[PDB]
Structure formats: structure tokens, C-alpha cells
């Protein structure tokens, strides 16, 4: 997908690291000079998602003292990263499909159509098909987006990868002069036998916690938190 | 079948004896021979049951919370008076929406036995609940004491009602007066203020003397009318009740929400 | 610069003498030599100005309606006490949103001269305004009388605060008691009920005797502390004020909204 | 953890002494000379939390009558202790995450951005992970606040410390001048044999209650008020 | 316009009698057996116009105990009369243009597109052009509708018809 400008759908559980994949695709494609605008559809309130993604003009709603422009126009000539697209409501799904195909959208309080050239990299953690037979996600939108799918597996299904991830985390933590830690075989094996809900964020958070706890020392099974210890 | 007289006991100032007047007037009107229902509109804090010594198993909090209907919370109080009990410090009764007050007032129409007396004991202050229960009543009886604060609070309640709801007829009853001239002078002062600023009709009902038999009755958790039926306060309550029974019955519904609009519509 | 002590006078039952205690306690604390501000939390009905004989040109209704700020509504009352006046039957003060109470409490932080006394005379009942003004105060002084209704109302207020806000420390002051043993017995009854149902700390402050000099002061529209400074009630208020001045000053802010959080944050 | 600038989350039960831990962390940090601003999210109504944390201008809503500084600005140069973070509403969670990430916030009803450098110490008694599982808490805010978790233990699990806590609580009453009281060995043993829900809160409440009730006295087995004797 | 199935825009002041003109066009065209469904946009609250015009399915909103179907499907094979179209908000205008051209619409709480064959006779009493330069009415919708305009004059400009 790197050399092709096409809409991407990244499938993976929460915390797998989809934003870095989106940034890697953006900065090494024809958009590398274009803006990268990340938006989390779960952060904006449902009543403000329209104004956030499309923008609004003067007096659009009570509190619209300025003509703030939306995320799509900020991503013109760049890439817009939709994260957890599954909670986005149905009318907004129809307008997103309109942006994807008809390359047009409407501001809030405006009576004109605007054309923007953006690349949409969508991310979600819900089974979109099951939502389709539940009557909650748009089926046509699902086919439009799942042309180039990236399935990012949980860390509990690639446990033998933990050592390399620890090397990368500790390497960055050393580059920023924030300390270093070292594990023995027992600690790494114990970590490999963990369920890891919140995979990579759990791993990074644990690394930071251990750097605070045991700086410049050897980490064993005893020095790991109780929830990580295993026999 | 007949229209039902509804009496709202109010006054804005706390501690003027609104609950004592309500309870004793209820028992006296039952003594004259009417079927009387007394409602404790002090919804957040119940004092009718405290003064009468009652310990209700179900209260109006159970009605609003939906565990029971309105008929099964009635209690047979002294002198045959049927009491509607209120809650005492229940989180679901501290403050209610106007929709809830409207529903509670409207639900009272299920009762069709009382002989045109329903005494409503409003809470202290000029808040939304007090105004809602006063506007829904045919007669408004203001209990006033011979103090500047009580006169000011009564004038404030009258001014609120007249300015924002167009009410013009008020009954005034003096309480804790140490002489009949004290009650007459108190009425004179209240009317002087109202005439100086407003155009409303104040009717003097009577005076309830300061009597320590009332204090003994409160200490005993019984009513002064039944505990000390020969005291000055009891006789004053009997005289007032005789005067109240001579009030004209309601005949025509008004446009706003009020108790027992059904009887005011079908009967004429 | 120092933390400011805030005293909330309450009790739920109306007519127990909350406003009289507030005014006289403020006057006595000013007599001991503190800069005292008295706030009339009776927002719908003003009685502090009535008892003190004041006729304020501008009140808190002007503050909330935005015609003036908070500093210019201060009045220099008796004994050097600065009074914040409330409205009397103004349609914009009958009931206020919790947002408005929060804004009014927060706006008091503009005052930086009082010597750690701010007395808040709350309204009758256990409503939202009373609870908001009690929770914002460091000390909660409950005025209780030797009556079943007053004991029940005070117990209901304590139960509400403890159950829904986790308060455990309360000060209790007896009013209109005809003997010191009456005040002791009243405290015993209140503590008996609270111990039987709750786990809270009640501290006895004192007793204010039933004194007709207070009634003469109310009739004269002046305060019993200044009108009759040698009466039993005045001496009792002086003793209570001496006891109140010995209360521990606040030292740490709490998580909720309270008066003068600025002084509780910066000073430590 | 006290010597570093990191987000601390104090986990335990109700009344376990989290504010004491937070104050000790603040006093032994580089921010000793700064303010300590506590915020209880379970003692402020949901509609008031935003105005209390961020501040407001002269007119922002139907009750704003003056312009005041919020508790983020009050904590500038110090630490902000958010107690009972679990009952914070979800929109306020989103806004708190945005403020923590961007290090900037805006007063309600204003368009001026202000920067504040504060240390966040949050406290919880609810099982957060279960809350993310039910979707009543945000996982991203969770992992921003959970850089260093400190788990406090119930008093029923540290029964041998009760006597020392009693002596410490009596000790602080010497400074806050509400009296003093002493205990008996049988009374101490009886207290040690108690379940203690709301551990330190009930211990302090009982000591306050017995001090005000019987000042400068001695407490026997029958001196205790109720449900504290154990055969 | 009677013998042609095309969208009609009736311009006239309030009370000129646009409903009877719409009924005359409907009952004397190829839709005579089809339903005639009149809807007054100003009558439905602005928050319920979506559900009223397009319908909704189970649990679409708090209070949706039934899957009531909208006005457009009731007008399938007939005519829908939009009265005072000028107060209809902009997103509704975009969806109306979509119904007019693409012949598709979406229900509330539904994730499927429905095709209906309806004839739209729009009526308004406001200067739609002035609303266009005021940024309140859709310009493309205005061109789509004003292909067959009927300007019904006020009675004060045809006073000599009062006798008839
Ligand atoms: N005529 C009278 N003589 C003596 N005491 C009287 C009296 N009228 C009232 N009282 C006393 O007034 C006190 C309060 O009475 P009551 O409870 O009826 O007042 P109230 O209902 O107006 C207070 P609130 O409005 O706050 O509920 C009691 O001690 C009662 O005995
Ligand atoms: N110590 C005392 N001795 C004698 N009478 C007293 C008294 N304290 C109060 N009173 C009487 O009680 C009346 C009411 O006092 P006050 O107005 O302070 O009470 P309160 O604050 O409970 C009224 P509200 O509840 O409406 O605010 C006084 O005007 C006086 O008649
Ligand atoms: Mg009462
Ligand atoms: Mg008062």
C-alpha cells in the first residue's frame, strides 16, 4: 500500500499501535509533505462530531463565534486518520462515503459544496461485519474501505516478539536519556505467558514503570508486578 | 357529589405555626361533622405525623417512587381525619420538578369521599412547591405573627402571588398573639403595607392566642384540640373552624391546575 | 493573609432562631475583635436587614442580575459587621440553579479583608440551597429546640448530609431553652437518635435561654446584643462566641466547592 | 517515585489514606514550594466539574457572574490531586486527556489558551480495568494516568499496625486541639478483631467520636459505642 | 405541467391556495390512482422532520416503540406536497436533492438505502433567491425545482376576480 494512494482500513485491538502505521504510510508516500491530521471519533462528543470533521461557519450553532474550518480541509493534500470509525453514526457514515467517492462535503451552516483531496486511513477495533448484520454500520462503506486491509495481531498471539519490542522500547528510552533496564530469562518468559489486554501500551507502560522502580538493576520475576508474575 | 373546598395554609415565615393551624383546623372541622383530609405538603420534611404521634409504614415517597398507589398511604388520624403522610429526609422528595407536583396534585382526584375539606400544609418559604400548592387551592389562609419578619415574609408571598399569578383574595390568621388587639393591630399593619403598594383583598379570619397548652401538646406528640380541648387555643380553633365552614364553596373551575377539577366541571 | 473560618447556621426547622443566632454571633465575634462578614443565604426572603433595621439600596439580586458587582452591595452593619443583603420576594432569587450558587460562592473570593469569620444564615428546610451553603462551610452549627419536630428535622438534615455527602462532624446549639438541663437533655436526645442510626460526631456548643429581651429587640428592629447587652441571651451569645473563637482554623482544602479555596491553597 | 515528575495513580479502597500519600509525594518532590490543589470528582456535580477545574469568564453560562481561575491554574507550579477519578463523566475524561496531552487548556466561555505545568496524582477505589471492559472509563486516559500505580492495603490486612495508627491519630489531635484520649489493651485487641470497611476513615471517625464523647478518658471493652466488640 | 411528470414549484403568498393547485395537478396526471400526501414542514418540529419525512426503524430514538414509515414511501407511486419548503434546514435540503436526483433516501436508525418513485410539488412563500444570497437555501436545489414555476398572484393584485 505504501506506493499506492488508496483508502486503508487497519484492523486491530485497542492499543496495538495503528497511529504509527498510519504515520509510516503517510510519511513514505506521495503525501509526505502534506499534513497528517489524526482524529479520534470517540473523543469528540456525538453532537459535535459534525462540526469537528466538516467545520462550520459564522453562527452555525449557539457558541459559534468563529468560522472554524474542519479536519478534512486541514488534511487537504495530506492524510486524515480516522480512529475507531465504528462508533461514528450512520448519517456521518453516509457523508463519509460521499467524501470518499464524490470527493465533496458540506460545512455546518453553509449552503455550498467543497472539494478536498484527502487520503483516508481508517482504524477500528470492532468486527465491522457483525455490526453490518446488527444494522449499525454501513455495508457499502465497509466494502469501500476494506480494499487494502491491515490486520495488526494482538501481542498475546505474537508473544515470541516481546524481546524485540523490549529492545526497541529500551533503546528509545536510552536515546532520550530516561534510563535503562535489563531483564533476565525468567522475567521475559513470565511476560510471554501474560494475556496482555492493551498490548503495546501495556508493554510500554510496564517498561516505564520498571524504569522508575528499578533503575540500573536486573529485573527478575520477583521484581515484576504481581499481575505479570507467572509460573 | 359536590365541589371540594381546598384550604392552603401558608405564610412564608417559618415557625409561625402553619402545621399546628393545619392539624387543629382539620380536627375542628371534623368535629363540626365534615370528612376532612389533611395533606402534608412539606414533602421533604414531615411534621404532621410527628405532631400527631403517627408512624406511617408507607408515605408519599412510596407513591412517587411507584411502589404503591395513593389510596393505600392514607392513615386514619385523630378525630377521623385522613392523613396523607410526607417523607422525612428522603432523597427523592427534597426537590421535585413542577411536572411531579402537577402529577401529585392531579392524582388526588382519585379520592371521592371527603366532605369538601382538604387542608394543605405548605412548607416555609416562597419556593416553587409552596406556590404550586397555594395556586391549586380555592382558599389561601396566611398565618402571620406580630413580628416585622413575619409581616415582611407574608407581604412578600402576597406580592409574589399577586404580581406573577394575579391572585387578589387572601385570608389572614394571627397566631401567637397575646391579646385580640394584638391581632387587630397586626392585620392593620399588614393591610397598611399592602394598600401602600398593592391592590389586593385581605380578609381577617381570627386570632389564635399564645397558649402553653400548645407547647405541652407538641411535647406529648398530640394535638392541642384533642389533648386540651378546653384551652384558649382549642376554643379559638373551634371559632375559626366555624368561620371557615361558612366560606362559600367553589362553583366554577379556573384555567390553571387545581385540586379536583373533575368535581368542579361535572357538577355545574 | 490567613485562612478564613466559615460558619453555616442551619437546623432545618423554621423558626428556631437561625437568623437571630447568626446576627448575634456575628456581633459578639466582632466584639471580641474580629472582622466579621455576615451573608444572608435566605436568598428569596431577607430577614437580616429586617432584624437589624437596614434598608439596603442594592442587594444580591442586583449582583445576580448583573447591574453591579459584589463589593458595592456590602453594608456596614452594627458593631462594624459587614452585611451581604439578600432579596425579599424577587422573581430572580426564589430558586436558583446549582450553577448560580456555585458562581455566588466562588465570587466571594474577591473579598480579602475579613478576619476569618464568615457567618452564613441558611434557609429553612433541607433544600438544595441549604445543602450547597452548608457543604461550602468549614463549620456547621445546627440550631435545635427541645421539640420533637425540631429534633426530627435536625436529625433529617444530619442524615441527609452524612448519607449523601459523608459529613461526620456537627456542632449543636440549643435555642429557646428554659433551663441548662433542658439543653443538655435535648443534646442527649439528638445524640441518642443519631447514635441509634448513624455514626457521626456531635459537639455541644451551648444553650441560648428563652429571653423576652430578644422579642423586644425584634420588635424594635435591632439586635439583642446591642439593644440589651446585659440580658441573659446577650451573655449566652458572648459565651458561645468565645467558644467559637477557640475552634481550630481550617488548614487544608477539600475536594468540593467551598468558600475561599484560594486562601486554603496558597497559604499552606 | 517522589523524586520524578510522573503521573501517580493510588489504588485501594474507600478511606485508605490516599490523600496522605499524595501529600507526602508532593512534599518530597521538586515542587515542595508549590501548591497542593485537591479535586474530588465525586463531591462535585457533573455540570460543575468543568467550570471548577478549568475556570470561566465573566459570562459563560447562566450563573457565571465573575472571572475566576480554575484548579489547573491554581496548581501551576505544584500538583493537582484528583480523588475519585472513576466517577468523572466521560466528556470530562476526554477533556482532561486533551489537557494532559497538549499541556494547554482554555477557560469555559473563552478562546485564550493557557499553559500550566502540574503534576497529576489521581486516586481510585474502583477497579478501573473492569470499567474499561464495560466502556465506562477511557483506556487512553487510564494509561496516561497509570505511569506509576501505588496499591494501598486494607486495614484488615495490616491488623498489626492498628495500634501505631491509633497513636498517630491521637498524636495529630495534639496539634489540631480537640482533646486527647487513651486506650486499653483489651480495647485495642477488640478493635484489631474488626472487619473495618472504610479503614482509616472509620478509625479516625471512631477516635474523634470517642474523644468528643469522653474527653481525656480511657476506653475499655464496654466503652466502645457499638459493633466494635468481638468475642 | 398537467401532462408531464416533473417537479413543480408553486410561488405565492400565504393563503393563496397552493394545496388545491397541487391536488388538481395530481388528480389529473398519471398519478391519479396514486396517493396524495401533504406535509407542512413548518408544522413538524425541526428535531422530528427527519423522522417524519423519511421514517424510522425500531429504537431509532427515545420514544421509537414502532417502526413508523415516512411520508416519501407513503407517496410512492403518487405525489408528495412540500409546503413552505423554505424553512426546511440545509441538511434536509441536501437529502431532498438526493431524493430528487438519485431517487434514494435513508430511514432513521437504518443502514440501507430505499428507492421511491414520487413526484415533488414544492410550495413556498419566501423569495428563494434572496435566501440563496443570504446563505440559507440551497442554490442547486433551487435550480432543480424551478423548472416549472407557478406564480399565484395575491388577491390584492387581481381584485376584479373577487366577484367570481
Ligand atoms: N399559639 C401558639 N402558642 C404557643 N406555641 C405555639 C403557638 N403556635 C405555634 N406554637 C409553637 O410553634 C412551634 C412551631 O409550630 P409548627 O411546627 O406548627 O410551625 P411551622 O409548621 O410554621 C414551622 P415550619 O414551617 O418550618 O414547618 C411549636 O413549638 C409550637 O408549639
Ligand atoms: N432566644 C430566643 N428567645 C426568645 N424568643 C426567641 C429566641 N430566638 C428566637 N426567638 C423567637 O423566634 C423568632 C424567629 O427567629 P428567627 O427569625 O431568627 O428564626 P429562623 O431563622 O428560624 C426563621 P426562618 O426559618 O424563616 O429563617 C424571633 O423573632 C423570636 O420571636
Ligand atoms: Mg410545618
Ligand atoms: Mg432566617
Residue numbers in the entry:
A (entry chain F), D (entry chain C): 163 to 393
B (entry chain B), C (entry chain A): 7 to 274
E (entry chain E): 163 to 326
What did the study's authors say about this model?
FleQ and FleN act as master regulators of both flagellar motility and biofilm formation, while using different transcription activation mechanisms dependent on the target promoter and the presence or absence of the second messenger cyclic diguanylate (c-di-GMP). FleQ belongs to the NtrC subfamily of bacterial enhancer binding proteins (bEBP) and has conserved FleQ/FlrA/FlaK/FlgR homologs in Vibrio cholerae, Vibrio parahaemolyticus, Vibrio alginolyticus, Shewanella putrefaciens, and Helicobacter pylori, among others. The protein comprises an N-terminal receiver-like FleQ domain (FleQREC) and a C-terminal helix-turn-helix DNA-binding motif (FleQHTH). In between is a central bilobal AAA+ ATPase domain (FleQAAA+) composed of an N-proximal α/β subdomain (SD1) and a C-proximal α-helical SD2 module.
